[PDB]
Protein backbone atom coordinates (compact mmCIF):
# COMPACT_ATOMS: atom_id res chain seq x y z
CA UNK A 1 0.00 0.00 0.00
CA UNK A 2 2.83 1.80 -0.61
CA UNK A 3 3.75 5.48 -2.18
CA UNK A 4 6.79 8.41 -2.46
CA UNK A 5 7.60 12.17 -1.54
CA UNK A 6 11.26 13.17 -2.76
CA UNK A 7 11.08 16.53 -0.81
CA UNK A 8 8.81 16.42 1.43
CA UNK A 9 8.31 18.91 3.93
CA UNK A 10 8.02 18.09 7.49
CA UNK A 11 8.38 20.37 10.41
CA UNK A 12 10.40 19.53 13.89
CA UNK A 13 7.95 19.88 17.29
CA UNK A 14 9.98 23.10 18.05
CA UNK A 15 8.93 24.96 14.56
CA UNK A 16 5.35 23.52 15.16
CA UNK A 17 5.35 24.68 19.03
CA UNK A 18 7.35 28.14 18.26
CA UNK A 19 4.55 29.01 15.25
CA UNK A 20 1.36 26.81 16.91
CA UNK A 21 1.59 28.09 20.96
CA UNK A 22 1.04 31.72 20.62
CA UNK A 23 -2.26 30.85 18.86
CA UNK A 24 -3.16 28.59 21.81
CA UNK A 25 -2.30 31.48 24.51
CA UNK A 26 -4.59 33.90 22.39
CA UNK A 27 -7.09 31.36 23.33
CA UNK A 28 -6.45 31.30 27.06
CA UNK A 29 -5.85 35.34 27.17
CA UNK A 30 -9.78 35.42 26.83
CA UNK A 31 -11.09 35.24 30.00
CA UNK A 32 -13.53 34.04 31.41
CA UNK A 33 -14.25 32.84 27.86
CA UNK A 34 -11.92 30.39 27.84
CA UNK A 35 -12.25 29.28 31.21
CA UNK A 36 -15.15 26.73 30.77
CA UNK A 37 -12.48 25.12 28.12
CA UNK A 38 -8.72 25.07 29.64
CA UNK A 39 -9.96 21.52 31.18
CA UNK A 40 -11.69 18.30 30.34
CA UNK A 41 -15.88 18.43 30.55
CA UNK A 42 -16.84 17.03 34.01
CA UNK A 43 -20.42 15.61 33.21
CA UNK A 44 -20.54 14.94 37.58
CA UNK A 45 -19.86 18.52 38.08
CA UNK A 46 -22.10 20.00 35.61
CA UNK A 47 -24.87 17.26 36.08
CA UNK A 48 -25.33 16.26 32.25
CA UNK A 49 -24.91 12.75 31.75
CA UNK A 50 -25.78 12.93 27.72
CA UNK A 51 -22.60 14.61 27.33
CA UNK A 52 -20.73 12.06 25.86
CA UNK A 53 -23.19 10.48 24.50
CA UNK A 54 -23.57 13.50 22.26
CA UNK A 55 -19.98 14.72 22.29
CA UNK A 56 -18.22 11.11 20.91
CA UNK A 57 -14.83 12.72 20.45
CA UNK A 58 -13.81 15.11 23.50
CA UNK A 59 -11.38 18.03 23.44
CA UNK A 60 -10.38 21.19 25.45
CA UNK A 61 -7.43 23.53 25.92
CA UNK A 62 -4.92 21.76 28.19
CA UNK A 63 -5.39 18.16 26.03
CA UNK A 64 -4.28 20.62 23.41
CA UNK A 65 -1.01 22.32 25.04
CA UNK A 66 -0.28 18.84 26.32
CA UNK A 67 -0.07 17.42 22.89
CA UNK A 68 1.71 20.65 22.07
CA UNK A 69 4.43 20.13 24.13
CA UNK A 70 4.97 16.51 24.20
CA UNK A 71 5.07 17.01 20.14
CA UNK A 72 2.08 15.01 19.63
CA UNK A 73 1.18 17.29 16.50
CA UNK A 74 3.91 15.96 13.11
CA UNK A 75 1.74 18.77 10.98
CA UNK A 76 0.18 21.99 11.79
CA UNK A 77 -3.34 20.62 10.45
CA UNK A 78 -2.90 17.98 13.57
CA UNK A 79 -3.34 21.25 15.90
CA UNK A 80 -6.49 23.15 14.14
CA UNK A 81 -7.95 20.14 13.78
CA UNK A 82 -8.55 19.74 17.53
CA UNK A 83 -8.83 23.44 18.17
CA UNK A 84 -11.70 23.02 15.85
CA UNK A 85 -13.19 19.88 17.43
CA UNK A 86 -12.92 21.68 20.81
CA UNK A 87 -15.02 24.80 19.15
CA UNK A 88 -17.60 22.37 17.29
CA UNK A 89 -18.25 20.35 20.32
CA UNK A 90 -19.47 23.30 22.37
CA UNK A 91 -21.68 24.02 18.90
CA UNK A 92 -22.75 21.03 19.12
CA UNK A 93 -23.31 20.82 22.89
CA UNK A 94 -25.14 23.74 23.86
CA UNK A 95 -27.85 25.85 22.87
CA UNK A 96 -26.84 29.29 21.05
CA UNK A 97 -28.85 30.99 23.72
CA UNK A 98 -26.21 30.03 26.04
CA UNK A 99 -23.29 31.28 27.99
CA UNK A 100 -20.97 28.69 27.39
CA UNK A 101 -22.07 29.06 23.22
CA UNK A 102 -21.78 32.05 23.08
CA UNK A 103 -17.82 32.03 24.85
CA UNK A 104 -16.97 29.56 21.67
CA UNK A 105 -18.27 31.55 19.34
CA UNK A 106 -16.35 34.63 20.42
CA UNK A 107 -12.93 31.84 20.57
CA UNK A 108 -13.31 31.00 17.54
CA UNK A 109 -13.35 34.49 16.33
CA UNK A 110 -10.05 35.10 17.99
CA UNK A 111 -8.55 31.71 16.70
CA UNK A 112 -9.71 31.99 13.17
CA UNK A 113 -7.87 35.66 12.99
CA UNK A 114 -4.84 34.26 14.85
CA UNK A 115 -4.30 30.60 12.88
CA UNK A 116 -4.69 32.44 9.56
CA UNK A 117 -1.60 34.19 9.60
CA UNK A 118 0.27 31.23 11.17
CA UNK A 119 -0.55 28.55 9.02
CA UNK A 120 0.27 31.23 5.87
CA UNK A 121 3.75 31.50 7.25
CA UNK A 122 4.38 28.09 7.51
CA UNK A 123 3.53 28.22 3.92
CA UNK A 124 -0.28 26.71 4.02
CA UNK A 125 -3.41 28.66 2.73
CA UNK A 126 -5.24 29.07 5.90
CA UNK A 127 -6.00 27.32 9.15
CA UNK A 128 -9.81 26.50 8.63
CA UNK A 129 -12.05 23.48 9.36
CA UNK A 130 -14.66 23.52 6.65
CA UNK A 131 -17.49 21.81 6.09
CA UNK A 132 -20.26 21.38 2.87
CA UNK A 133 -24.05 23.45 3.39
CA UNK A 134 -26.67 20.63 4.29
CA UNK A 135 -28.28 18.36 1.53
CA UNK A 136 -31.82 16.76 1.03
CA UNK A 137 -27.27 14.57 11.11
CA UNK A 138 -23.35 14.51 8.89
CA UNK A 139 -21.78 16.99 7.00
CA UNK A 140 -19.41 16.09 4.03
CA UNK A 141 -15.87 18.00 4.51
CA UNK A 142 -14.25 20.17 2.31
CA UNK A 143 -11.86 19.35 -0.38
CA UNK A 144 -8.37 18.93 -0.09
CA UNK A 145 -5.17 18.74 -2.15
CA UNK A 146 -1.25 17.74 -1.46
CA UNK A 147 1.59 19.85 -3.11
CA UNK A 148 3.78 17.70 -5.58
CA UNK A 149 7.45 18.95 -3.87
CA UNK A 150 6.10 20.21 -0.53
CA UNK A 151 3.73 17.51 0.22
CA UNK A 152 1.45 19.54 2.19
CA UNK A 153 -2.07 19.26 2.64
CA UNK A 154 -4.07 22.26 1.36
CA UNK A 155 -8.10 23.27 1.09
CA UNK A 156 -8.82 22.84 -2.78
CA UNK A 157 -11.25 25.89 -2.75
CA UNK A 158 -8.25 27.86 -0.88
CA UNK A 159 -5.87 26.76 -4.01
CA UNK A 160 -8.62 27.11 -7.02
CA UNK A 161 -6.37 23.73 -7.99
CA UNK A 162 -8.23 21.30 -10.63
CA UNK A 163 -6.20 18.72 -12.30
CA UNK A 164 -8.46 19.17 -15.20
CA UNK A 165 -7.12 22.66 -16.16
CA UNK A 166 -3.35 21.80 -14.39
CA UNK A 167 -2.96 18.17 -15.38
CA UNK A 168 0.11 17.90 -14.24
CA UNK A 169 -0.76 18.07 -10.58
CA UNK A 170 -0.44 20.50 -7.25
CA UNK A 171 2.63 22.70 -7.19
CA UNK A 172 2.02 25.68 -4.09
CA UNK A 173 3.17 28.92 -4.51
CA UNK A 174 6.28 28.83 -2.71
CA UNK A 175 7.63 25.97 -4.60
CA UNK A 176 6.77 27.38 -7.62
CA UNK A 177 9.16 30.58 -7.18
CA UNK A 178 11.63 28.03 -6.14
CA UNK A 179 11.26 26.61 -9.60
CA UNK A 180 11.56 30.00 -11.07
CA UNK A 181 8.74 29.46 -14.22
CA UNK A 182 4.75 30.93 -13.36
CA UNK A 183 1.13 28.43 -12.78
CA UNK A 184 0.42 27.86 -16.52
CA UNK A 185 -2.55 29.77 -17.49
CA UNK A 186 -6.35 29.09 -17.00
CA UNK A 187 -7.84 28.81 -20.42
CA UNK A 188 -11.11 27.35 -19.37
CA UNK A 189 -11.88 31.07 -18.55
CA UNK A 190 -15.01 32.91 -18.43
CA UNK A 191 -13.71 35.24 -21.18
CA UNK A 192 -12.72 32.44 -23.37
CA UNK A 193 -16.19 30.72 -23.91
CA UNK A 194 -17.50 31.29 -27.41
CA UNK A 195 -18.48 34.95 -27.98
CA UNK A 196 -22.31 35.50 -29.25
CA UNK A 197 -23.95 39.31 -30.53
CA UNK A 198 -26.24 39.06 -27.45
CA UNK A 199 -23.72 38.28 -25.04
CA UNK A 200 -21.23 41.32 -26.53
CA UNK A 201 -24.45 43.13 -26.67
CA UNK A 202 -24.82 42.75 -22.65
CA UNK A 203 -21.34 42.76 -22.14
CA UNK A 204 -20.49 45.85 -23.82
CA UNK A 205 -23.74 47.62 -21.98
CA UNK A 206 -22.73 47.10 -18.83
CA UNK A 207 -18.85 47.55 -19.19
CA UNK A 208 -19.59 50.85 -20.84
CA UNK A 209 -21.76 51.46 -17.71
CA UNK A 210 -19.02 50.85 -14.99
CA UNK A 211 -16.40 52.53 -16.79
CA UNK A 212 -18.37 55.71 -16.36
CA UNK A 213 -18.97 54.91 -12.52
CA UNK A 214 -14.56 54.90 -12.01
CA UNK A 215 -14.85 52.63 -9.17
CA UNK A 216 -11.64 50.93 -8.41
CA UNK A 217 -12.91 47.81 -6.83
CA UNK A 218 -14.97 47.33 -10.16
CA UNK A 219 -13.28 44.48 -12.01
CA UNK A 220 -14.28 43.32 -16.12
CA UNK A 221 -17.84 41.52 -16.44
CA UNK A 222 -17.96 39.19 -18.99
CA UNK A 223 -21.62 37.86 -20.02
CA UNK A 224 -21.26 34.84 -22.32
CA UNK A 225 -24.80 33.02 -23.39
CA UNK A 226 -23.63 29.03 -22.81
CA UNK A 227 -26.46 27.65 -24.39
CA UNK A 228 -29.35 28.23 -26.66
CA UNK A 229 -31.30 25.85 -28.67
CA UNK A 230 -35.07 25.09 -30.76
CA UNK A 231 -37.98 23.95 -28.24
CA UNK A 232 -41.67 23.83 -28.38
CA UNK A 233 -43.93 24.87 -25.84
CA UNK A 234 -47.43 21.65 -26.08
CA UNK A 235 -50.53 22.89 -25.22
CA UNK A 236 -52.16 21.02 -22.30
CA UNK A 237 -55.08 18.89 -23.33
CA UNK A 238 -57.97 20.62 -21.85
CA UNK A 239 -56.46 24.07 -23.98
CA UNK A 240 -56.19 21.53 -26.56
CA UNK A 241 -59.32 20.34 -26.39
CA UNK A 242 -61.21 23.99 -26.44
CA UNK A 243 -58.87 25.66 -28.90
CA UNK A 244 -56.75 22.83 -31.16
CA UNK A 245 -59.38 21.30 -32.24
CA UNK A 246 -61.55 24.16 -33.58
CA UNK A 247 -58.38 25.18 -35.11
CA UNK A 248 -58.11 28.61 -32.99
CA UNK A 249 -54.63 28.14 -31.61
CA UNK A 250 -51.79 25.96 -32.44
CA UNK A 251 -50.87 22.67 -31.11
CA UNK A 252 -47.48 23.76 -30.37
CA UNK A 253 -45.50 27.34 -29.68
CA UNK A 254 -41.77 27.41 -31.65
CA UNK A 255 -39.51 29.05 -29.14
CA UNK A 256 -35.56 29.42 -28.97
CA UNK A 257 -34.22 29.32 -25.10
CA UNK A 258 -31.34 30.91 -24.11
CA UNK A 259 -29.16 30.22 -21.09
CA UNK A 260 -26.56 33.48 -20.58
CA UNK A 261 -24.66 34.38 -17.67
CA UNK A 262 -22.42 37.26 -16.03
CA UNK A 263 -19.19 36.69 -14.55
CA UNK A 264 -17.25 39.77 -12.67
CA UNK A 265 -13.17 39.08 -12.36
CA UNK A 266 -12.82 39.30 -8.60
CA UNK A 267 -8.99 38.90 -6.81
CA UNK A 268 -7.90 38.13 -10.44
CA UNK A 269 -10.39 35.03 -11.22
CA UNK A 270 -13.77 35.12 -12.48
CA UNK A 271 -17.25 34.95 -10.28
CA UNK A 272 -20.30 34.01 -11.35
CA UNK A 273 -22.83 36.55 -9.97
CA UNK A 274 -25.59 36.27 -12.29
CA UNK A 275 -27.76 33.75 -14.36
CA UNK A 276 -30.74 34.50 -16.99
CA UNK A 277 -32.80 31.99 -18.88
CA UNK A 278 -35.49 33.37 -21.54
CA UNK A 279 -37.85 32.10 -24.07
CA UNK A 280 -37.95 33.94 -27.29
CA UNK A 281 -40.98 33.16 -29.50
CA UNK A 282 -40.03 34.49 -33.31
CA UNK A 283 -41.82 35.84 -36.31
CA UNK A 284 -43.14 32.50 -37.51
CA UNK A 285 -44.77 32.09 -34.09
CA UNK A 286 -48.36 31.65 -34.19
CA UNK A 287 -50.62 34.05 -32.64
CA UNK A 288 -50.73 34.38 -29.28
CA UNK A 289 -47.30 34.28 -28.93
CA UNK A 290 -45.78 36.09 -32.10
CA UNK A 291 -42.48 38.12 -31.86
CA UNK A 292 -42.31 37.86 -27.60
CA UNK A 293 -39.43 37.45 -25.32
CA UNK A 294 -40.29 35.95 -21.57
CA UNK A 295 -37.87 35.91 -18.50
CA UNK A 296 -38.58 32.42 -17.45
CA UNK A 297 -35.87 32.71 -15.25
CA UNK A 298 -33.32 34.75 -13.39
CA UNK A 299 -30.89 34.24 -10.10
CA UNK A 300 -27.65 35.82 -8.47
CA UNK A 301 -24.87 35.46 -6.37
CA UNK A 302 -24.58 38.82 -3.65
CA UNK A 303 -20.45 38.99 -4.44
CA UNK A 304 -20.31 41.31 -6.97
CA UNK A 305 -17.54 44.14 -6.20
CA UNK A 306 -18.29 46.86 -5.60
CA UNK A 307 -21.64 45.55 -3.46
CA UNK A 308 -23.39 49.27 -4.50
CA UNK A 309 -23.06 48.99 -8.57
CA UNK A 310 -24.68 45.49 -7.69
CA UNK A 311 -28.25 45.94 -8.29
CA UNK A 312 -27.07 48.87 -10.56
CA UNK A 313 -25.54 45.70 -13.20
CA UNK A 314 -28.38 43.84 -13.01
CA UNK A 315 -30.58 46.71 -14.92
CA UNK A 316 -28.02 47.15 -17.52
CA UNK A 317 -28.29 43.29 -17.95
CA UNK A 318 -31.64 42.98 -18.28
CA UNK A 319 -32.46 46.16 -20.03
CA UNK A 320 -29.22 45.59 -22.49
CA UNK A 321 -31.61 42.43 -23.29
CA UNK A 322 -34.78 44.09 -23.97
CA UNK A 323 -32.80 47.02 -26.40
CA UNK A 324 -31.00 43.87 -28.18
CA UNK A 325 -34.73 41.72 -28.70
CA UNK A 326 -36.19 45.03 -30.02
CA UNK A 327 -33.68 46.03 -32.23
CA UNK A 328 -34.17 41.96 -33.42
CA UNK A 329 -37.65 42.72 -34.37
CA UNK A 330 -39.33 41.30 -30.75
CA UNK A 331 -42.53 43.57 -29.61
CA UNK A 332 -43.20 42.45 -26.35
CA UNK A 333 -41.13 41.28 -23.67
CA UNK A 334 -42.74 39.52 -20.71
CA UNK A 335 -41.69 39.03 -16.61
CA UNK A 336 -43.45 36.89 -13.72
CA UNK A 337 -42.14 38.75 -11.00
CA UNK A 338 -41.97 35.51 -8.37
CA UNK A 339 -39.56 35.20 -5.60
CA UNK A 340 -38.18 31.99 -4.90
CA UNK A 341 -40.10 29.40 -2.87
CA UNK A 342 -38.18 29.43 0.71
CA UNK A 343 -34.98 27.38 0.59
CA UNK A 344 -35.25 26.38 -2.85
CA UNK A 345 -32.45 28.25 -5.56
CA UNK A 346 -33.60 29.35 -8.87
CA UNK A 347 -30.01 29.60 -10.82
CA UNK A 348 -27.22 29.04 -8.62
CA UNK A 349 -26.98 25.80 -6.24
CA UNK A 350 -26.25 27.02 -2.92
CA UNK A 351 -26.92 30.92 -1.73
CA UNK A 352 -25.33 32.66 0.84
CA UNK A 353 -26.71 32.46 4.13
CA UNK A 354 -26.62 36.03 4.20
CA UNK A 355 -27.84 36.61 0.86
CA UNK A 356 -31.58 37.52 1.41
CA UNK A 357 -34.73 37.08 -0.72
CA UNK A 358 -36.35 39.66 -1.80
CA UNK A 359 -40.75 39.85 -0.80
CA UNK A 360 -43.31 39.48 -3.58
CA UNK A 361 -43.68 43.05 -3.22
CA UNK A 362 -40.17 44.31 -3.49
CA UNK A 363 -39.32 42.40 -6.35
CA UNK A 364 -42.20 43.66 -8.37
CA UNK A 365 -40.47 47.18 -6.91
CA UNK A 366 -36.93 46.05 -8.19
CA UNK A 367 -38.49 44.83 -11.68
CA UNK A 368 -40.76 48.20 -11.85
CA UNK A 369 -37.58 50.36 -11.34
CA UNK A 370 -35.53 49.15 -14.05
CA UNK A 371 -38.32 49.11 -16.44
CA UNK A 372 -38.47 53.17 -15.98
CA UNK A 373 -34.87 53.02 -16.19
CA UNK A 374 -35.70 51.54 -19.63
CA UNK A 375 -38.24 53.62 -20.25
CA UNK A 376 -36.55 57.03 -19.78
CA UNK A 377 -33.70 55.76 -21.95
CA UNK A 378 -36.19 55.31 -25.00
CA UNK A 379 -35.75 51.89 -25.05
CA UNK A 380 -39.08 51.04 -24.02
CA UNK A 381 -41.85 52.41 -25.23
CA UNK A 382 -44.61 51.53 -22.39
CA UNK A 383 -44.88 48.59 -19.81
CA UNK A 384 -48.27 47.88 -18.14
CA UNK A 385 -49.56 44.55 -15.72
CA UNK A 386 -50.82 41.81 -17.27
CA UNK A 387 -54.90 42.59 -16.04
CA UNK A 388 -54.62 46.47 -16.86
CA UNK A 389 -52.90 44.90 -20.59
CA UNK A 390 -56.35 42.61 -20.95
CA UNK A 391 -58.89 45.37 -21.20
CA UNK A 392 -56.70 47.83 -23.61
CA UNK A 393 -56.50 44.95 -26.18
CA UNK A 394 -60.05 44.11 -25.36
CA UNK A 395 -59.21 40.18 -24.81
CA UNK A 396 -62.27 37.87 -24.43
CA UNK A 397 -60.96 34.35 -24.74
CA UNK A 398 -58.08 32.58 -23.12
CA UNK A 399 -56.50 32.11 -26.29
CA UNK A 400 -55.34 35.67 -26.47
CA UNK A 401 -52.94 35.47 -23.92
CA UNK A 402 -49.18 34.48 -24.41
CA UNK A 403 -48.93 30.69 -23.14
CA UNK A 404 -44.72 30.35 -22.02
CA UNK A 405 -42.90 27.20 -20.92
CA UNK A 406 -43.57 26.65 -17.48
CA UNK A 407 -45.56 29.52 -16.59
CA UNK A 408 -48.56 29.82 -14.59
CA UNK A 409 -51.09 31.16 -16.74
CA UNK A 410 -51.31 27.97 -19.25
CA UNK A 411 -51.83 25.82 -15.66
CA UNK A 412 -54.34 28.75 -14.37
CA UNK A 413 -56.33 27.73 -17.79
CA UNK A 414 -55.69 24.27 -17.23
CA UNK A 415 -57.05 24.07 -13.54
CA UNK A 416 -60.37 25.37 -15.12
CA UNK A 417 -60.80 22.35 -16.41
CA UNK A 418 -63.12 21.58 -13.07
CA UNK A 419 -64.89 24.74 -13.63
CA UNK A 420 -63.52 33.31 -13.01
CA UNK A 421 -60.41 34.06 -15.33
CA UNK A 422 -60.50 37.34 -15.97
CA UNK A 423 -61.06 37.79 -12.08
CA UNK A 424 -57.56 35.92 -11.40
CA UNK A 425 -55.59 37.87 -13.86
CA UNK A 426 -56.20 40.81 -11.25
CA UNK A 427 -55.99 38.34 -8.16
CA UNK A 428 -51.97 38.75 -9.48
CA UNK A 429 -51.23 42.24 -9.31
CA UNK A 430 -47.31 43.46 -10.24
CA UNK A 431 -46.71 39.76 -10.61
CA UNK A 432 -47.31 39.65 -14.55
CA UNK A 433 -45.75 42.64 -16.75
CA UNK A 434 -45.85 42.99 -20.06
CA UNK A 435 -43.22 45.60 -21.84
CA UNK A 436 -43.43 47.11 -25.02
CA UNK A 437 -40.59 47.50 -27.39
CA UNK A 438 -42.05 49.17 -30.28
CA UNK A 439 -39.36 42.30 -41.81
CA UNK A 440 -39.11 38.92 -40.16
CA UNK A 441 -36.57 38.57 -37.05
CA UNK A 442 -33.00 36.70 -37.90
CA UNK A 443 -30.75 35.83 -34.50
CA UNK A 444 -27.77 36.10 -36.16
CA UNK A 445 -26.19 34.01 -33.22
CA UNK A 446 -25.48 30.34 -33.91
CA UNK A 447 -27.27 27.89 -31.43
CA UNK A 448 -25.38 26.71 -28.95
CA UNK A 449 -25.60 22.70 -27.58
CA UNK A 450 -24.64 22.33 -24.26
CA UNK A 451 -26.84 20.01 -22.26
CA UNK A 452 -26.13 21.37 -18.61
CA UNK A 453 -27.50 24.65 -19.58
CA UNK A 454 -30.49 23.49 -21.19
CA UNK A 455 -32.77 23.75 -18.43
CA UNK A 456 -32.37 25.15 -15.14
CA UNK A 457 -31.72 21.66 -13.74
CA UNK A 458 -29.04 20.11 -15.31
CA UNK A 459 -26.86 22.89 -13.28
CA UNK A 460 -28.46 22.35 -9.92
CA UNK A 461 -28.31 18.72 -9.78
CA UNK A 462 -24.70 18.54 -11.19
CA UNK A 463 -23.45 21.70 -8.55
CA UNK A 464 -25.54 19.92 -5.52
CA UNK A 465 -23.31 16.28 -6.43
CA UNK A 466 -20.04 18.05 -7.04
CA UNK A 467 -20.94 20.77 -3.97
CA UNK A 468 -20.18 23.93 -6.54
CA UNK A 469 -22.23 26.15 -3.97
CA UNK A 470 -22.56 29.76 -4.46
CA UNK A 471 -22.84 30.76 0.00
CA UNK A 472 -19.34 32.63 0.03
CA UNK A 473 -16.90 34.07 -2.26
CA UNK A 474 -14.40 31.53 -1.62
CA UNK A 475 -16.48 28.59 -2.51
CA UNK A 476 -18.28 30.80 -5.95
CA UNK A 477 -14.57 31.38 -6.91
CA UNK A 478 -14.90 27.57 -6.81
CA UNK A 479 -17.79 26.71 -8.30
CA UNK A 480 -16.95 29.24 -10.88
CA UNK A 481 -13.95 27.58 -11.99
CA UNK A 482 -15.62 23.87 -11.93
CA UNK A 483 -18.56 25.08 -14.30
CA UNK A 484 -16.64 27.19 -16.70
CA UNK A 485 -14.33 23.71 -17.05
CA UNK A 486 -17.49 21.38 -17.37
CA UNK A 487 -19.11 24.14 -19.92
CA UNK A 488 -15.61 24.66 -21.93
CA UNK A 489 -15.72 20.42 -22.33
CA UNK A 490 -19.32 20.01 -22.91
CA UNK A 491 -18.74 22.93 -25.90
CA UNK A 492 -15.88 21.97 -26.93
CA UNK A 493 -17.56 18.91 -28.70
CA UNK A 494 -19.64 21.19 -30.76
CA UNK A 495 -16.72 23.19 -33.20
CA UNK A 496 -18.33 23.25 -36.96
CA UNK A 497 -17.01 25.46 -39.47
CA UNK A 498 -17.56 26.84 -42.87
CA UNK A 499 -16.40 29.81 -44.61
CA UNK A 500 -18.22 33.34 -43.85
CA UNK A 501 -18.25 34.21 -47.48
CA UNK A 502 -18.38 30.72 -49.39
CA UNK A 503 -20.20 28.44 -46.62
CA UNK A 504 -18.31 25.47 -47.85
CA UNK A 505 -17.37 23.50 -44.72
CA UNK A 506 -13.54 24.69 -44.04
CA UNK A 507 -10.73 22.67 -41.68
CA UNK A 508 -7.75 25.03 -41.58
CA UNK A 509 -9.31 28.52 -41.30
CA UNK A 510 -8.05 32.22 -41.20
CA UNK A 511 -10.11 33.84 -37.93
CA UNK A 512 -9.89 37.44 -37.63
CA UNK A 513 -8.96 38.94 -34.22
CA UNK A 514 -10.82 41.77 -34.32
CA UNK A 515 -14.08 39.97 -35.47
CA UNK A 516 -16.68 38.11 -33.01
CA UNK A 517 -16.63 35.21 -35.61
CA UNK A 518 -15.22 35.43 -38.98
CA UNK A 519 -13.82 32.36 -40.30
CA UNK A 520 -13.03 32.70 -44.34
CA UNK A 521 -11.75 30.06 -47.42
CA UNK A 522 -7.90 29.65 -47.55
CA UNK A 523 -7.52 32.47 -50.39
CA UNK A 524 -7.69 36.25 -48.83
CA UNK A 525 -10.42 40.81 -48.81
CA UNK A 526 -10.31 42.05 -45.52
CA UNK A 527 -9.00 44.51 -43.14
CA UNK A 528 -8.38 43.09 -39.76
CA UNK A 529 -5.66 40.52 -38.22
CA UNK A 530 -6.30 36.88 -39.54
CA UNK A 531 -4.24 33.84 -37.84
CA UNK A 532 -4.30 30.54 -39.27
CA UNK A 533 -5.92 27.76 -37.51
C1 LIG B 1 -39.91 33.36 -12.11
C2 LIG B 1 -38.87 34.44 -12.25
O1 LIG B 1 -38.27 34.67 -13.26
S1 LIG B 1 -38.63 35.36 -10.75
C3 LIG B 1 -37.01 36.15 -10.97
C4 LIG B 1 -36.53 36.67 -9.63
N1 LIG B 1 -35.42 35.88 -9.11
C5 LIG B 1 -35.16 35.77 -7.81
O2 LIG B 1 -35.86 36.29 -6.95
C6 LIG B 1 -33.92 34.98 -7.46
C7 LIG B 1 -33.31 35.41 -6.14
N2 LIG B 1 -33.07 36.85 -6.07
C8 LIG B 1 -31.93 37.42 -6.46
O3 LIG B 1 -30.99 36.79 -6.94
C9 LIG B 1 -31.81 38.93 -6.27
O4 LIG B 1 -32.49 39.32 -5.08
C10 LIG B 1 -32.23 39.78 -7.50
C11 LIG B 1 -31.28 39.51 -8.67
C12 LIG B 1 -33.65 39.40 -7.92
C13 LIG B 1 -32.20 41.27 -7.18
O5 LIG B 1 -30.85 41.72 -7.00
P1 LIG B 1 -30.59 42.80 -5.85
O6 LIG B 1 -31.09 44.13 -6.27
O7 LIG B 1 -29.18 42.69 -5.42
O8 LIG B 1 -31.52 42.19 -4.70
P2 LIG B 1 -32.62 42.70 -3.65
O9 LIG B 1 -33.48 43.73 -4.29
O10 LIG B 1 -33.29 41.52 -3.04
O11 LIG B 1 -31.65 43.30 -2.54
C14 LIG B 1 -31.54 44.71 -2.28
C15 LIG B 1 -31.50 44.95 -0.78
O12 LIG B 1 -32.75 44.51 -0.20
C16 LIG B 1 -32.48 43.63 0.87
N3 LIG B 1 -33.56 42.64 0.94
C17 LIG B 1 -33.84 41.66 0.04
N4 LIG B 1 -34.78 40.83 0.43
C18 LIG B 1 -35.14 41.31 1.68
C19 LIG B 1 -36.07 40.85 2.64
N5 LIG B 1 -36.78 39.73 2.51
N6 LIG B 1 -36.17 41.56 3.78
C20 LIG B 1 -35.39 42.63 3.96
N7 LIG B 1 -34.48 43.15 3.13
C21 LIG B 1 -34.39 42.43 2.00
C22 LIG B 1 -31.11 43.02 0.59
O13 LIG B 1 -30.49 42.59 1.81
C23 LIG B 1 -30.39 44.22 -0.01
O14 LIG B 1 -29.85 45.05 1.04
P3 LIG B 1 -28.45 45.83 0.82
O15 LIG B 1 -28.37 46.02 -0.68
O16 LIG B 1 -28.59 47.13 1.58
O17 LIG B 1 -27.34 44.95 1.36
ZN1 LIG C 1 -7.55 26.79 3.54
ZN1 LIG D 1 4.72 22.82 -1.90
ZN1 LIG E 1 -12.85 41.05 -39.70
ZN1 LIG F 1 -14.26 30.79 -48.97
Redesign the pocket.
Known sequence: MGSSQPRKKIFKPEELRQALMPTLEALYRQDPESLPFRQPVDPQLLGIPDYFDIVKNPMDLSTIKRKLDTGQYQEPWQYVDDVWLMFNNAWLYNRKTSRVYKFCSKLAEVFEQEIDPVMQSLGYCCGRKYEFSPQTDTLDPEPFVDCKECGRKMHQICVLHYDIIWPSGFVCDNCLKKTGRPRKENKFSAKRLQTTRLGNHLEDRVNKFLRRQNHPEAGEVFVRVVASSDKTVEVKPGMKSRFVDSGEMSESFPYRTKALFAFEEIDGVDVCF?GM?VQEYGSDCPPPNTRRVY????????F?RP??L??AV??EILIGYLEYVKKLGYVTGH??????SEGD????HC?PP??????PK??Q???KKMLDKAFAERIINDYKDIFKQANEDRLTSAKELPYFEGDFWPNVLEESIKEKLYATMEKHKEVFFVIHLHPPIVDPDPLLSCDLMDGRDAFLTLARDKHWEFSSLRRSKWSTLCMLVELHTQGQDRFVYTCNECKHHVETRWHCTVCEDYDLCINCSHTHKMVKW
Open positions: FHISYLDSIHFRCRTYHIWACPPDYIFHDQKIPKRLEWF
